Each structure stands twice: as structure tokens, then as C-alpha cells.
Amino acid sequence: VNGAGLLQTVWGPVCELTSELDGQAGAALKKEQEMLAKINDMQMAQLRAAIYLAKNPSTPHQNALAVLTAYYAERAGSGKAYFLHALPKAVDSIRRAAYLKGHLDEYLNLLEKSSGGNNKCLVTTDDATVATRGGDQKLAGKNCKLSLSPLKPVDAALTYITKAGVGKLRYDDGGAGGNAVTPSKSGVHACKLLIAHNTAGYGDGGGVTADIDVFAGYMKVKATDAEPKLAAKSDLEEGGGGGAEAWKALHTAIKQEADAEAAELTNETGKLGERRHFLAAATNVLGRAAVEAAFGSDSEGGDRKIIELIEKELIVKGTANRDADESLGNIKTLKELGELLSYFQLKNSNTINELRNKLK
Amino acid sequence: VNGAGLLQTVWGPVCELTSELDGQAGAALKKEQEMLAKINDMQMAQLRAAIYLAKNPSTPHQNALAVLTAYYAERAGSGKAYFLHALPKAVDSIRRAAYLKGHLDEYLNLLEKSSGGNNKCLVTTDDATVATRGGDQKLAGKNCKLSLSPLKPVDAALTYITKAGVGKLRYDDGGAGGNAVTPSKSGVHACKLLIAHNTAGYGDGGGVTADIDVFAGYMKVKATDAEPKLAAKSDLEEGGGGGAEAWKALHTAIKQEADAEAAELTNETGKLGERRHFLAAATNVLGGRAAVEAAFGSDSEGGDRKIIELIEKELIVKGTANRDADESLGNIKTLKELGELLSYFQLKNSNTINELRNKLKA
Ligand SMILES: *[C@@H]1O[C@H](CO)[C@@H](O[C@@H]2O[C@H](CO)[C@@H](O[C@@H]3O[C@H](CO[C@H]4O[C@H](CO)[C@@H](O)[C@H](O)[C@@H]4O)[C@@H](O)[C@H](O[C@H]4O[C@H](CO)[C@@H](O)[C@H](O)[C@@H]4O[C@H]4O[C@H](CO)[C@@H](O)[C@H](O)[C@@H]4O)[C@@H]3O)[C@H](O)[C@H]2NC(C)=O)[C@H](O)[C@H]1NC(C)=O
């Protein structure tokens, strides 16, 4: 018999999903912050190499330093372009996930609170057992957080919707008299919200004009005397039919998320002669032979020696009006690094003019 | 008499608001993109001034170039820090705005589609006139887009919720038998969804346990024989009471939105000797106001315009850093290209220094 509440095998998974959506924005924020940290790491590595070269013009490693500054600049530009390419996709995943969560929280809340006396709209396995909150704020043992927690950059698993599509939900069933999604109405227990018709639902004198999409289209409330009908799995996924656009758009948004470990953001690692962007830098500022001669190595790590020299270079108190000695590898603001490059570039200009005056 | 649909003076404004929320993400995207563009412009201006000094060691503007490079570096760091501080606020505004829109669209759709025969849940001015979609997809003359448009970085006004709070909605009314939010039920026309009670609503045998927040708390569906109760304006804003957290949290996020033309992102203006970060740059790389005036040869508001124009108009000939064509330095606008030019000329400086020292060797 029609007219009872919604079985937990249906809404339970929806509760778990909306609870996962709560943390999607914080996970995306964390990924954006980590991407920006890599780009800034490249930009600062460029300046440190440039500072070391300006500080030690007569260094025997000028060719290696010229290659490294040009390489880190390309890495900074390539990382910056990848971030701009990923930014619309990140925004939309935040937008689409929270929009779906708002749909689910509105209707889940309405059903959960439509409880009292005969009214039992979220039930477990039968018409008489209504869901209640436990001390741990679980709803009949399920996570069901129907609001947004404060934004925090921490990862949060999203397992009910992935690049592969939706999972762990019920599909297809209902839409008639089989009591597949609601238990048989055995007596006084009822939930008139789940049918848009007058016999066992909230319709007055008859049904509405046509079935109604709820849960952003995951479920249809019928305009006839019939229990709700669950959408097909493919209706919730990219390429599916109509009726659940918010689900498909979120799947698509998740499919198109950028890779946080993309090659465009990360230092190149191969043998120095195989490193494509090392070679391009050497080609433009000084190919293979030039790279390997500047670093005195064909190995995978022939750059570690000059890299360590840059990091450990001592910047004495008073250099660029600095208040204490520090290692160049620990200076990590653009203001400080830019002032050091300017200080040494100015010194070099005065060295050039003085030597040229002596020679003339 | 209780039991009719919802008056358009209530849902009309909610339809207009949810239509505005559709474009919030794109406006936020546009602002972030424009902010990143300013930061990148500072970084590239630093590189051009540094390239010009390296290319022209014998310039008479060496002190001015050292000041500008250090200044543009401070600007790039100051803009980057401002963007990183604004990024959580941007994410939350996107998250909170779309989350509220999802709430409003779910319930609006349910009421709009609960139409047919006696069922009339969104009405205009009386119990018998149900709202319908026109040719332009307006709902009884109102914009009511219950879905998200494709994301576009385009301006989109959000006027119903601002830094000052919410506006243009009805507040306070309802919660009993006065028919302030529903018209009096004259006959067969009905909407049982709007009261969680059995006399004129969808309750079975009695009311539910407690009033129910709908429209994310903008309105309460009553557990007693009573029409819905609209929240007070202050309950929808930062610092308000309970019942509409999704509204207060969106107001807060909007209050904390970043300024796209913030001082931290833009060039300093005015007399050179009064530009705080020009003065700080000069102090640190030269060892204040007097050093700045001497470097640029002026105290006017536009004392830096002469060296800035020299940088922009400097010719970079084909073959410099393996470049394939002549170009003005002010038109070179990638970090790869500018970084290869600075590297090329820094190397030239090293070789110029070594050659001069060997020539001069005693
Ligand atoms: C592409 O490749 C370049 C070159 O490798 C790289 O640039 C380098 O970036 C790092 C920053 O990412 C620069 O700074 C180094 O950063 C590490 C990590 O710092 C973080 O983590 C530590 C530990 O939790 C925190 O304390 C710190 O706050 C940060 O969160 C630091 O550990 C480094 O400090 C060491 O080196 C200093 C300079 O010599 C030392 O004085 C300091 O004590 C540390 O000593 C290290 O080396 C010692 C000698 O072997 C060893 O005994 C110690 O145990 C320790 O290992 C340093 O601050 C670094 O300067 C950059 N290098 C150059 C040449 O620019 C880019 O990051 C990379 N790009 C990407 C995107 O990955």
C-alpha cells in the first residue's frame, strides 16, 4: 500500500554523499594553495640563481647560472599558465558541488523534520521506525551533515561521485505500487510529501500536472498514485539523459579537474642532457653539449652542486640594509630577493663603469 | 482561512535572488583572474627594469633602476600575499552562494511544479491564480532560473545580498492566521505543502514535532495550523539569531570579499619622495626621500615617467637571447622570454667584467 516514508536504503547513501560534499571546497582550496606554492618556488629559485650570479660575477659557473635562471623562469611561466588554465575548472567544481549539496540538504531536511505522530518521512526498513539523531549527530547511524562546516584547507574524500561516475546509490526502482522505495503503509504511519497525488499524497482533490524532480533529479515524486521513481545511474552522469542536470554537471566538473602533480608545475628530473627545458634555456641564452659543459656532468643530478652553492651563499648583515646574516637558500620573500638582486646589479654597474674608466 | 499557496510578494524576490546567484561564481572568477594579472604585471615590470640595467650598465639612471626593480619586487610580493589572503574568502563566497542557490532552487521547483487542478502552490495575488512560465521563461513575469548557467568570467550583479546585508525581500510576517504570506483560502484551491499540520497542510493525524526551516531558513513551515513565518531581516545577516545559517554565512563571506583595486595590488602614485615603498626600496638598496629625488632627477608626481618610458621603448634586436625578431622591451610579456633576456644580459655582464679585469691586469 502506498503512502509511507522513504526507505533508508535510498536516503542513507544520499546522506553520506551530502556529508562528503561538505568538505569539497576545502579540498579544492588546499589544491589551489599547493599549486601556487610550487609556482612561487620556481620564481624564487630564479631570483636566487640571479642573485648569486650578480653577487659573484667572476664565478666559474656563469654558464650554469644563466641556464638555471632561464630554466626557472620558464618553469614559473609554465606553472602560472597551468594555474590559470585550472582556475575555471576549480571554481566550477566548488560551485557545482555546493549547488548539488544545497539541493540535497533542502529536501533531506524537509523529510527529516517531517516527523511527529503519524508523520514518518525518513524511515529505516518499515513504515513505523522513523530516523532520529543520535548523541553523535548521526541519523539512524549515517553521517548526515545538512549544512556547511567552516572552510578549512584539508583533504576530504569524495567517493560517491568520481571521474568514473556515481556509485553506491540505489537506482531505477519505484514509480508504481511495488513498495521498492517506500515500505508498505500498514496503518496510521504516513508521509504525504512523497506522492503528488490525493489518494496517499499531498495533492488536493487529485494529482499535479506532471511528475516532480526532487533531490536535483535523483528521484521523481509522481503526479499519480505511485511511489517515487529513482533515476537511472546513467541519468546522473555526463552524457546521460535529462532530468538530473546538476548531477551530470558535477560529474563533468569532477572529470575535468586539473592534476596537482602535473608536469607543468614540477622540476624536471632526467639526465641533464635529456631535460627538454634545460636544453631550450641553454639554446636561447648560451644544446646538449652546452648544457653538459656548463654543469660538468651528463648525469641525473649534475645540477645539485651549483644548486647547493646558491642555497648556502652567505648574505652578510648590512647587505641591502639587512639586519642579520642569512643563507641565500632561506630568503623567501620577493621583496627581500628583489632588493638583493638590485643591490648586486647596482654594484655590478658601478664595477663596470669604474673598470671602463680605468681603461679609457 | 489557511491552506492556499504562497503569495508572489514572498517568492518573487526569492526567484530574483536565486537568478542572481547563478552568476556569482563567474564574477568571482573574473575578479581572481584580474587580480592575478596585476600581480604578474608587477613581476614583469621588475624584470624589464632589471633587464634594462643589465643591458646598459653605464646608464646614468642606475640608481633609479635599482629603486624601481626593488619597488616592483615589493609590489609583486605585496600583491601575491594579498591574493593568498583573499583566496579562502573567494572560495567560500563561491561555495556559500551556490549552496544557498541549491536550497532555494529545490524548494522553488517543488512549489512551482506542485500545480494542477486544485493544487496551486505559487500564486500571484489570490488563491486561484497560479504562476506559469511565459515564452521568455519568466515565472509570472519574474526571472526564476532554477539551474546553473555555464561558468563564464563575466560581471554579474548580486544586489539582494551585499556588504550591508540583505535587501528587497519581505521579512517578519506570518506564522498564524492573518494571511500575510498566503491568501485566504476561498474554496477548492489549495497548497498542502506550506503547513506541516493536518487541518490545512500535509500532516497526517496531527502536526510534526517542530517548525521546519525551508528556503534554507528564510521561512518556517509551521508544525501547527498556521501559515509560514518569514525570518526577520537581522536573522539573515551576520550576527543574527538562529534558523538561517546559510544566509548569515553568505553575508559574512560577501562582507569579507577582496578589493580588486586594493592598494596592495596597484602602483603607488603621488610625489616620489612620499611613496612609502619607493622610499623603503631606496633606503634598503642605496643606504630616503633625498636618495629618491637624486636618482630620478625630479620630485614631481611623474618623476619616474622618464625612466619607465626608456625601459618600455628599449629595442631588443633579433638574435638577442636567440629571439627571432626585433621588439620593444615594453611589449615582451612572458616570464620565459623576460627571464631568458635577464639571463642573457647577466651573462654578458659577467663576461664584460672578466674581460675588463684581464685587460687591466698589471
Ligand atoms: C625546483 O628546484 C629548486 C632547487 O632545488 C627548488 O628551489 C629551492 O626551494 C626551496 C624551497 O622550496 C628553497 O629553500 C629550501 O627549502 C627547504 C624546505 O623548507 C620547507 O620545509 C622545511 C622543513 O619542514 C621548513 O623548515 C621550511 O620552513 C619550509 O617549510 C629547506 O629545508 C631548506 O633549508 C635548508 O637549506 C638551507 C640553505 O643551505 C639551510 O641553511 C637549512 O638549514 C636547510 O639545510 C638543508 O640542507 C643542509 C645541507 O645539506 C642539510 O644539512 C639540512 O638538513 C637541510 O637539508 C631551504 O630553505 C631553496 O633555497 C631553493 N633552492 C634554490 C637553489 O633556489 C624549487 O623549490 C623546486 N621547485 C619546485 C616547484 O619544487
Numbering used by the authors:
A (entry chain B): 29 to 314, 325 to 398
B (entry chain A): 29 to 315, 325 to 399
Structure paper excerpt:
During infection of mammalian hosts, African trypanosomes thwart immunity using antigenic variation of the dense Variant Surface Glycoprotein (VSG) coat, accessing a large repertoire of several thousand genes and pseudogenes, and switching to antigenically distinct copies. In the salivary glands of the fly, the pathogen adopts the metacyclic form and expresses a limited repertoire of VSG genes specific to that developmental stage. We present here three novel metacyclic form VSG N-terminal domain crystal structures (mVSG397, mVSG531, and mVSG1954) and show that they mirror closely in architecture, oligomerization, and surface diversity the known classes of bloodstream form VSGs. The VSG protein can be roughly divided into three functional units: the signal peptide for delivery to the cell surface (and which is cleaved during translocation), a large N-terminal domain (NTD) that forms the bulk of the molecule, and the smaller C-terminal domain (CTD) that is tethered to the NTD by a flexible linker that can often be removed by endogenous and exogenous proteases.
We also crystallized mVSG531, predicted to be of the Class A2 group, determining its structure to 1.95Å resolution. Consistent with bioinformatic analyses, mVSG531 is very similar to the structures of other Class A2 members solved from BSF VSGs, particularly VSG1 and VSG2, aligning to each with a RMSD of 2.1Å over 354 residues and 2.4Å over 347 residues, respectively. In fact, with 35% sequence identity, the structure of VSG1 is similar enough to mVSG531 that we were able to use it to phase the diffraction data through molecular replacement. Most of the divergence between VSG531 and VSG1/VSG2 occurs in the top lobes, with the bottom lobe showing higher conservation, and the three-helix bundle the most conserved region of the molecule (RMSD close to 1Å). The positions of the two cysteine disulfides bonds in the top lobe of the N-terminal domain closely overlap with several of those in structures of bloodstream Class A2 members, although this does not hold for all Class A members, such as A3 member VSG13 and Class A1 mVSG397 and VSGsur. The N-linked sugars of VSG1, VSG2, and mVSG531 are located in very similar positions in the lower lobe as well. (A) Eight molecules of mVSG531 was found in the crystal asymmetric unit. (B) N-linked glycan is attached at Asn295 at the dimer’s bottom lobe (salmon pink spheres). Two disulfide bonds are observed at the top lobe of each molecule (green spheres).
